[PDB]
Amino acid sequence: SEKCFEPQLLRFFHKNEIWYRTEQAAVARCQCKGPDAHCQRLASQACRTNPCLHGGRCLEVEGHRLCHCPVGYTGPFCDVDTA
Numbered sequence: 001s002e003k004c005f006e007p008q009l010l011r012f013f014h015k016n017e018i019w020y021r022t023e024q025a026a027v028a029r030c031q032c033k034g035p036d037a038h039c040q041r042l043a044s045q046a047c048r049t050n051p052c053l054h055g056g057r058c059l060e061v062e063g064h065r066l067c068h069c070p071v072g073y074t075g076p077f078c079d080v081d082t083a
Helices: none
Strands: 004-006 011-013 018-022 027-032 037-042 057-061 064-068
Touching (some): 004 027, 018 057, 027 057
Antiparallel strands (some): 004 011, 027 037, 057 064
């Protein structure tokens, strides 16, 4: 019943929970086994409009827009300062 830690989200997930993890290109969908996650890399597309701040790359999967943030920023839109 160990949980899985996702550093991109600073969040622990329970067994069977599912979340997205970004790379520069592209996105992966992860499910917690505990403590390890099993992830599947998905083909994503670029968002037409980019809501990501500070150089974030916007990746679209399930029509849903994710931001791959640069160092110094995090959050849904690279809007949370890490410093």
